[PDB]
């Protein structure tokens, strides 16, 4: 629970004065609640014993004032507690999001796009719940216990030994129960985590599960996880079921000892009768508050693990930032250098790109050809500066991508990745990610360029046709054409087609390429493709094998001098 304290200390400091106001108001309210029985004892002693009804009425008015103070201070504490809890939760969420948005591809891949979502909302909620339950109930038990001890000492110090001995017994019993419960609760949380991951995997790959008839194995796995979770929860509940009886028993035994010892003191003229009522109410308030506070302690292990996850997210430091003072060329539209680039993924034993050196002149088309796992997508990601070169330099427009701020470099680059993603909403909304200010006319022009205008015009809603979460309401080629249209609507200086024509038929692929050549004539294009038929039109073709460039030149020189490209052409020949 080291990370819990750090997170609370960091993100509750702006609300520390509201917390102090909550604390003082709760103290006042609990003091009023424990002082009402003192006024009852005063009625019993200075009233019916003396025979003064006027004193009884006066003390009733005093009790009315005490109750008014109690309700006012309770409402005032609830309001500020809610304020502080919601503020802490909102600030923690806004900090986690702001940290995650600075992550790189590798940093985000460390946790995943779903773990970050579950840590941004449900991990902050489980700590704001602790905040609220501490400013509402967990603070009541110490306040009520110490205040009741003081009030019992005030009423009659002779019988304060009871109230000072009974409370430690309850404290030790509840401490034993907590010490035997907390490991079980940690196990229950760590085991419900697994049954949640199982259900997430079952829903993310439902089509693959159905296609392979993996329903019975999924059922068996879920049944085993459910049974183990139920065993852990039953073991926790067996201990948790002792909390209320072991507190009520202490209250009742304390009350019986009260009636005995107070009676013994009363026979000696050392105690008034109303003190018995006062002490009885003190017991049934002090110990009931402790019981209520302790019964709720299902949060601390859960909050501890949630805070551990949040702190591990917030401790991750990015590796690709604007260096100190980025160079800002006007309208970057130049060439790509790639001089002796050497890249090795973090945690990898061997580099994936070795001694890569090829230049792409501005306004030309360069096709990257290689085997599976050769490093074409890695090179494309290097151009986008999603990853930083371990050695060498890239030199886009004659200047390193490292010293260029990555907002203008990305504004000058229109990238359609191999693993594309279409956001849920409308086709117009998805295309707006390219421009965000595009009119309907240029949106339709971008759709027409990417051959995506027909299947959007077909829908009765036109540009407002719905899009599923991952575009699963479209075909794969339709998703690729939508991504191409999104890249086109940007009108970027550099196009990076990372296998953007894999799911397009020959006719549609040729039409899209012709429209692009008509539109992107003045723009640099780097296209990663498998078909040789699409690479003759490229001015320069680069072949990479094992991660290193094995051939540079046009189609004819590569077919004549590079054995790998000759093998590719021979394999694809009809």
């Amino acid at each position: 629970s080291n990370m819990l304290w750090a997170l609370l200390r960091q993100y509750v400091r702006p609300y520390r004065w509201l917390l102090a106001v909550v604390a003082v108001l709760q103290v006042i309210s609990n003091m009023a609640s424990l002082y009402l029985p003192t006024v009852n004892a005063a009625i019993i002693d200075d009233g019916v014993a003396k025979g003064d009804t006027a004193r009884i009425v006066e003390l009733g008015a005093v009790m009315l004032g005490v109750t008014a103070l109690q309700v006012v201070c309770a409402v005032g504490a609830v309001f500020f507690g809610a304020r502080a809890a919601t503020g802490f939760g909102h600030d923690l969420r806004a900090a986690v999001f702001t940290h995650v948005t600075t992550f790189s591809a590798e940093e985000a891949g460390r946790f995943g796009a779903a773990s970050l979502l579950t840590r941004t909302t449900n991990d902050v909620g489980h700590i704001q719940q602790l905040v609220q339950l501490t400013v509402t109930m967990l603070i009541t038990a110490p306040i009520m216990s110490i205040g009741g001890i003081f009030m019992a000492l005030h009423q009659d110090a002779g019988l304060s030994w009871l109230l000072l001995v009974s409370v430690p017994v309850l404290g030790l019993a509840n401490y034993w129960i907590i010490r035997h419960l907390m490991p079980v609760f940690t196990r229950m949380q760590s085991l419900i985590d697994g049954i949640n991951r199982v259900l997430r995997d079952q829903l993310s790959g439902i089509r693959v599960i159905r296609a392979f008839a993996r329903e019975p194995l999924e059922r068996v796995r879920f049944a085993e996880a459910n049974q183990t979770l139920s065993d852990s929860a039953l073991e926790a509940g067996r201990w948790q079921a002792l909390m209320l009886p072991v507190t009520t028993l202490v209250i009742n035994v304390s009350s019986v000892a009260l009636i005995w010892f107070g009676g013994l003191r009363i026979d000696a003229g050392q105690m008034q009768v109303g003190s018995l009522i006062a002490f009885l109410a003190y017991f049934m308030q002090i110990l009931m508050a402790v019981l209520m506070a302790t019964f709720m302690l299902v949060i601390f292990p859960r909050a501890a693990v949630c805070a551990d996850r949040i702190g591990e997210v917030l401790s991750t430091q990015t590796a690709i930032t604007n260096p100190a003072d980025p160079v800002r060329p006007a309208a970057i539209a130049g060439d790509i250098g790639v001089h002796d680039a050497t890249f090795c993924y973090p945690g990898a034993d061997r580099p994936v790109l070795q001694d890569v050196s090829f230049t792409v002149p501005r306004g030309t088309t360069t096709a990257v050809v290689g085997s599976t796992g050769s490093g074409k997508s890695t090179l494309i990601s290097l151009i986008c500066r999603l990853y930083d070169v371990t050695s060498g330099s890239l030199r886009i427009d004659g200047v390193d991508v490292r010293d260029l701020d990555i907002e203008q470099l990305w504004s000058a680059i229109g990238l359609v990745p191999q693993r594309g993603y279409l956001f849920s909403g409308t086709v117009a909304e998805n295309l707006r990610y390219g421009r965000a200010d595009a009119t309907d006319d240029e949106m339709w022009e971008a759709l027409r360029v990417a051959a995506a205008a027909d299947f959007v015009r077909a829908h009765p809603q036109g540009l407002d046709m719905p899009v599923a979460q991952g575009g699963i309401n479209f075909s794969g080629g339709q998703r690729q054409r939508l991504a191409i249209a999104r890249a086109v609507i940007r009108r970027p200086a550099i196009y990076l087609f990372d296998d953007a024509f894999s799911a397009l038929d020959v006719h549609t692929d040729a039409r899209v390429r012709d429209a692009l050549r008509e539109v992107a004539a003045d723009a640099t294009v780097v296209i990663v493709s498998q078909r040789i038929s699409t690479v003759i039109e490229a001015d320069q073709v680069v072949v990479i094998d094992d991660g290193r460039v094995v051939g540079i030149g046009t189609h004819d020189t590569l077919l004549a001098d590079c054995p790998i490209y000759a093998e590719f052409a021979e394999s694809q020949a009809l």
């Binding site: 009402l36 009790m63 609830v78 948005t101 779903a114 002792l242 009636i259 693993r419 040729a510």
Partner: protein, 616 residues
């Protein structure tokens, strides 16, 4: 919109089934509550005995109670005699500590019995709560496995995930956190009311005035707070949706310069959800102080009136002490219910969402017949299908596939090839017509066996978080190590696995890992081929795989492709060449079909498609 009362009563019915264990739970709770409520009367009797002895000790022993009363009347202020009138002392006796000890021993025994009964009832409640939760989780998982694909395609993954896991966990927390409190409160209120009615009707009426007023205040607060709760839930859902869409497509958002817009939208949603949560939480927490205030007003009235009666002599002091204890033990359950109202409402909302998911329409009545392919011949007969009915995607389609024939499907980008092979796997219900494999309608056989008989390479590759060996063995986990190694070698997964320093043990994920798109497709191919399917479907199975590796893979799988009726979908004509039958479909209808030689001889769409390679 959303019915919370019905979901609450359904959840209560699930929690407390027919009288097998819930009857014992209720009986134990009632017995313990009655035994523990009896005790304060005993304590009041002991206090009455102490006061009687103390008062009577001071009075002279030569006079009885009536003489003492008349002597006090002869004395001043009059009220002492009224106090003694209802006291029933024996003057000059003192306190009898033996009777006090007996009374307190009886109280201690009753309190011990009540504590034991409460413990047993709590254990039984825990057992039944866990049983109910197990049943709920099993039902949720079965419903997940029975839902149609349109249900998942029409919603975000995060929303369904939260409705499936987070809502169930919230329900579990709420029940195991509040069921015992609810039962104890509902029994204790009535037991205390009965014993207060036994003590004195006036003071118990004064105490019971609170319940109407407390209910009115609670109703007002709930009326003011329910819109806040629904707004908070809506706002949390919107925030979670925005977070999921930003995180899943982080590369696209970051690259296309939309990070600032996403940050601004998140800030707006965060502020709005903060406001909604603050309002809901404040109005939900306001219940307990109000109930405590009304209970304290009743306590003040009861104390004052009881003191007035005790001074007059109509009620003994021990009875009034018992009644004060009863007032406190009556006000406490209402305060506890008011305090836990927030958790109760959260659990009710979660149960509402879970029941909404569980009441969704399922696919269809699955046939119990086990699919059994004998030869492998596939036939389509006027198959018509359409997602979102009103726009056909496949209409008037008919095709025949010989048992050893390799059928290749080529066509435009939105023809319907994936829809066709999904209809073959019974992913979606065929609108009109039927599909027959070896003369039996696929709709008349179980989906499980039919989909197990066919090994399909999905167009969108998917891998679950685990080792590469686990992902390959996902097709058939019972296969031994040698079979998985052979499947990986045939698909040339082993070629790049040997390169990695943790071969077959490196952990890969759908969104990343130590893998590439081509290698991910290779692992999917190995997973498909491991299951030794009797029917082969390959939907753009090598779209991201180079042709040099494709040649080796084709040679390696030629043993399987000989006698398994492969369905090959590809936009590369080289892969689909030399297929026994080639289907060209344009807009969900097969415009032309035949082998390569006939297709070239008759010209048509295929000839134009293959002349693009030669240029024009």
């Amino acid at each position: 919109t959303r019915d919370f009362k019905g979901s609450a009563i359904r959840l209560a019915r699930r929690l407390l089934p027919q009288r097998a264990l819930t009857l014992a739970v209720i009986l134990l709770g009632v017995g313990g509550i009655a035994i523990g409520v009896i005790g304060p009367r005993i304590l009041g009797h002991a206090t009455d005995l102490l006061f009687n002895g103390v008062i009577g000790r001071e009075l002279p022993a030569g006079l009885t109670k009536e003489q003492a009363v008349e002597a006090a009347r002869a004395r001043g202020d009059g009220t002492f005699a009224d106090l003694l009138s209802g006291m029933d002392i024996v003057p000059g006796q003192g306190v009898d500590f033996g009777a006090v000890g007996r009374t307190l021993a009886l109280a201690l025994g009753l309190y011990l019995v009540a504590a034991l009964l409460v413990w047993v009832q709590a254990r039984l409640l825990n057992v039944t709560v866990q049983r109910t939760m197990v049943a709920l989780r099993a039902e949720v998982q079965e419903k997940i496995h029975r839902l149609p694909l349109s249900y998942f395609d029409s919603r975000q993954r995060g929303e369904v995930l939260s409705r499936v896991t987070n809502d169930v966990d919230n329900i579990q927390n709420s029940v195991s956190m509040t069921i015992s409190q609810l039962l104890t409160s509902v029994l204790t209120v009535f037991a205390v009311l009965v014993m207060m009615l036994t003590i004195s009707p006036l003071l118990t009426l004064f105490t019971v005035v609170t319940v109407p007023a407390s209910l009115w205040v609670t109703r007002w607060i709930t009326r003011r707070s329910q819109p806040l709760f629904v707004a908070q839930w809506r706002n949390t859902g919107r925030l979670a949706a925005h977070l999921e869409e930003t995180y899943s497509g982080f590369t696209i958002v970051k690259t296309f310069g939309h990070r600032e817009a996403a940050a601004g939208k998140f800030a707006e949603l965060n502020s709005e959800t903060q406001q909604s949560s603050f309002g809901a939480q404040f109005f939900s927490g306001l219940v307990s102080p109000a109930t405590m205030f009304i209970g304290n007003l009743s306590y003040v009235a009861v104390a004052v009136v009881g003191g007035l009666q005790v001074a007059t002599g109509q009620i003994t002091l021990g009875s009034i002490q018992a009644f004060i204890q009863y007032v406190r033990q009556f006000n406490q359950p209402l305060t506890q219910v008011a305090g836990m109202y927030n958790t109760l409402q959260s659990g009710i909302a979660s149960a509402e969402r879970v029941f909404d998911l569980l009441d969704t329409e399922e696919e269809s009545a699955d046939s119990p017949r086990r699919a059994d392919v004998r030869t492998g011949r596939v036939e389509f007969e006027h198959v018509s299908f359409s997602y979102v009915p009103g726009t056909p995607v496949i209409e008037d389609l008919s095709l025949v596939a010989e048992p050893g024939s390799t059928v290749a499907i080529v066509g435009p980008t939105g023809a319907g090839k994936t829809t066709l092979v999904n209809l073959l796997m019974r992913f979606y219900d065929v609108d009109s017509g039927r599909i027959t494999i070896d003369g039996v309608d696929i709709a008349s056989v179980s989906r499980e066996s039919l989909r197990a008989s066919i090994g399909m390479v999905l167009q969108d590759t998917w891998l679950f978080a685990g080792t590469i060996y686990d992902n390959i063995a996902y097709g058939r986990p019972d296969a031994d190590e040698d079979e998985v190694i052979e499947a990986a070698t045939a698909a040339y997964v082993d070629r790049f696995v040997h390169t990695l320093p943790n071969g077959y043990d490196t952990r890969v994920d759908d969104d990343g890992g130590a893998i590439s798109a081509g290698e991910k497709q290779l692992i999917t191919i190995a997973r498909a081929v491991l299951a030794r399917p009797k029917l082969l479907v390959l939907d753009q199975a090598t779209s991201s795989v180079d042709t040099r590796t494709e040649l080796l893979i084709a040679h390696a799988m030629a043993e399987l492709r000989r006698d398994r009726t492969s369905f090959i979908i590809a936009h590369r004509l080289s892969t689909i060449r030399d297929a026994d039958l080639i289907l060209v479909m344009d807009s969900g209808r097969i415009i032309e079909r035949g082998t390569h030689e006939e297709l070239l001889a008759r010209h048509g769409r295929y000839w134009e498609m293959t002349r693009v390679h030669l240029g024009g």
